[PDB]
Write a protein that binds this ligand. Structure first.
Ligand code: HEM
Ligand code: HEM
Ligand code: NA
Ligand code: NA
Lengths: 157, 155, 155, 157, 157, 157, 155
């Protein structure tokens, strides 16, 4: 089905941002593994796998809409040096990506692209569950301290 | 995240509605059990549990949106005295909840708060396709077989 | 049967107490979940469910005694802002419920309503041996290990 | 195998009537479900599934006989307002469709189309078992009353 | 619940089109079975079953909204003579039916009928997955040729 | 363990190339899925998963060697328009990446980095098994023709 | 077969290293157990067992190469007095073993003794990817959470 050019452009931009998220989440997961923080590894890895599924769905939607998926471009990665900075960078990226998703859902509704909108709404609920998790982690660092919080991440389960 | 102020107010009104629904379904289920009408007791008790699930989802959403859930306020309960009256009160109240849910879904669409929109859409789908439809079926059955036959099936 | 009028009034006050407990434990459990403190969320949610069970027993007893359960009235909720405050509010409110349960057990003994006495004795046994004791243990643990160690165990 | 034109015409007419039956039975089953009469739902739905299988067999026979199945035409639907009227409409349609089946079996025998006749005889036994069921339901309404009869349909099993 | 007259009219029109789709897909599946193309049979049959479920949901929604489901009307069937023509007719019908679904979703949103809209969005995602499959089949015929493509449909699995 | 700067640079360059391979293989797998060539989808997807594991191992090795994994840079993607062109682009990328791996193994041996060399040798055997598969596919296209070859990719198993 | 004389000497030095590692990990694991730090006890004991496996492989290779394994000689053990010191001594000694393994792998490559090369490459892969990495992670965790939190996780 020939999709709207604006919808394909928005999907390609959400795809760029999902790929940037995959890369940042995997680098952060492996930086966490390198420090022995295994539960943070596990969370960031499953989140990178999740954005992997999201990018897969966006590529398939851009292909179905007879567009050209743009896997070449990536955004700038925010790689932190320590756990708090990495969590803040992840938070900032989730927030930017949620703003982007909301703009794309608005445009998909304006163009009567309703299955693109359903796709983007699944991506939105997932990204906003991870936003919830990151805010929980920040509150936990504020509550128990960074040393106690990091001690809880040593064991993966 | 920081939710829209109007979206949190509307979510809190929906929460008041769900909590009042829980109370009304609770007392109605137990009034059905007091009368030996165990099938209505079980159905209405499970609906009170579903209202508790909806209220949990709304409270979680209000807290995520950095709002203060209002579990203290309660709407006026309309308790019936006989089976038809309690079924009609439950139906009136489901109608009011569905209307208010539609208003808040429209508001969430205007305020770009899409995720609250799907939470409320799941709530509206339950309200319509789970118990408004059931109540209309029950009142139609009372109309078809009569109240004494209808109550006989509910024991 | 026709219950004593004072026994039904006291059962209705206990019902108001249990319903307010349910609301407070509900919002506190969800405030704990919003903060990532899943162990407190689960504990306080199960206590809200136990309050719902107690309220169900009280409503069933009031209806059996040919009274009108009052599920509309609610006491003022005391919602805390931080973990220690919410635990202390839950403890204050459990203390009030236990005191009021003891008064009603004494009344049921004077009014020869022995079966209401054992229903309320089971309620008092839960209130003391299930969650007042747990809350006192939690506050003592906060005193022993500190609040940051205590909250770390609750994630 | 090239079938007789008369036999293919009769099979196409029985097919039109089987499709009309499918539609009427499904509308009636869902009208029954909408009223909470679940056992009547179940009966009318399995009957619509049965006429579905019948239409499938007639289409396959018309295709084997190098004819063109006519799925475009439908007969007029008799949709009732209440349970008794719906059962009477179902009865009338079964009776008309049985007359049609008997005419088609006679013609299939006159043309030595014996497997068409076996097909139509299976459809006849099925339609006439449902005729038996509908007559049983009418007798039950006459015996226990409509309110007692409808009360027995509330639970599907 | 008393539904909007416009929403019930749109649902009835989507229902007419879903019933037409059921009939066309079943005729095409049995024309494919008659030619020994078994995997095409299987696909077209499961698609007719799927539109069957869609029509069931639309009937139940029109009944819940206190409307009258219209199972009497059907649209004109596009029945092809050969595999490519049948696939093109299926494609044309899916495209028309998707346009219709999008109009109905727009109207359901304008009338705050959000569960009707959710229903129609499920029908839209299903119809547009079948659109994807039909476009895949056309590309495969263009890639491997019609004789190679039809050879791949001989065995059902 | 503090690794040699040259070895970390070579590992980062092999990482850039592994990430480029992941992106190209996934785009090609989903272009194949879009055309209904399912077995080619499956192969290219498992190959992208394999280069995914390779990039994971390279990131972990660069982190263990107290280097900074570079997930930001990607090489230019060679995206083909048709199956043969996509397979040739995959072939060219495998060959370039094998040359790179051999240079990195030589350097790792010259620096007595023997576990880096073992890592790179596993990546080499995997990349060169995929080189074997791509050469097999080219020979099969030359033997059976492109239409027969593409017909064999329609079914995933 | 008749192994190269230099390759057997280097294999014997690696054997002395592995045996000293075994002794040090053994006494350190038991010093961890004496202090109630059972997770460190178990980890360091399993590492002493892996050192025993490496020493078995080296002895088998030296005997196959028609050499005389030297299990009598031992390097000086560096026993720590507190957890950080024992972890740092284990890390220093893993570093020395990895350096010496690299020298012997280079020698086996020059002497065409490829099979000794892969035996030592498996040994080096264990030394790096099994316990040098683990020790660096442990010291980084001590740096991040502190020593008292780190030791609390090891009980
Ligand atoms: C030309 C008309 C039709 C034909 C030949 C036909 C044929 C069939 C057949 C053979 C089955 C599978 C039965 C089984 O194996 O148990 C089926 C299933 C079904 N049909 Fe139809 N059908 C037709 C129209 C319809 C219509 C108009 C509706 C609803 C409005 C409908 C609703 C269903 C449903 C709900 C199912 C169950 C889905 C399933 O099999 O899992 N059908 N149909
Ligand atoms: C730094 C780059 C990446 C790394 C390190 C990485 C790593 C991984 C790993 C280890 C897996 C699980 C493999 C398995 O256990 O079978 C995986 C799964 C997957 N990846 Fe990636 N990946 C990367 C980028 C991407 C990209 C850019 C895409 C798509 C555009 C993608 C698509 C997928 C898909 C679809 C899956 C399957 C989901 C699943 O595991 O259930 N990946 N990835
Ligand atoms: Na601690
Ligand atoms: Na062929």
């Amino acid at each position: 089905m020939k999709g709207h050019p604006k919808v394909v452009g928005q999907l390609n931009r959400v795809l760029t941002c999902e790929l940037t998220a995959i890369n940042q989440y995997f680098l952060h997961a492996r930086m966490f593994k390198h420090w022995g923080l295994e539960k943070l590894n596990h969370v960031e890895y499953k989140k990178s796998i999740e954005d992997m599924k999201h990018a897969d769905k966006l590529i398939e939607r851009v292909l179905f809409l007879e567009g050209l998926p743009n896997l070449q471009q990536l955004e700038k990665l925010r790689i932190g040096e320590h756990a708090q900075e990495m969590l803040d960078c992840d938070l900032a990226m989730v927030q930017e990506q949620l703003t982007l998703l909301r703009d794309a859902i608005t445009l998909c509704e304006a163009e009567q692209d309703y299955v693109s909108r359903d796709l983007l709404e699944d991506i939105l609920e997932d990204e906003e569950e991870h936003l919830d998790w990151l805010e929980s982690q920040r509150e936990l660092i504020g509550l128990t301290g960074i040393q106690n919080y990091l001690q809880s991440q040593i064991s993966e389960s | 995240m920081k939710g829209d102020k109007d979206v949190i107010d509307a979510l809190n009104r929906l929460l008041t509605g769900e909590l009042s629904a829980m109370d009304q379904y609770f007392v109605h289920a137990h009034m059905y059990e007091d009368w030996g009408l165990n099938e209505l007791y079980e159905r209405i008790a499970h609906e009170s549990d579903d209202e508790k699930g909806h209220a949990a989802k709304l409270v979680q959403r209000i807290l995520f949106l950095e709002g203060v859930p209002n579990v203290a306020a309660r709407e006026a309960l309309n308790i019936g005295s006989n089976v038809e009256e309690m079924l009609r009160n439950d139906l009136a109240y489901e109608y009011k909840v569905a209307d208010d849910l539609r208003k808040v879904i429209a508001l969430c669409e205007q305020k770009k708060d899409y995720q609250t929109r799907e939470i409320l859409e799941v709530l509206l789908d339950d309200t319509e396709s789970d118990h408004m439809y059931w109540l209309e079926k029950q009142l139609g059955l009372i109309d078809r077989i009569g109240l004494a036959n209808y109550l006989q099936t509910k024991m």
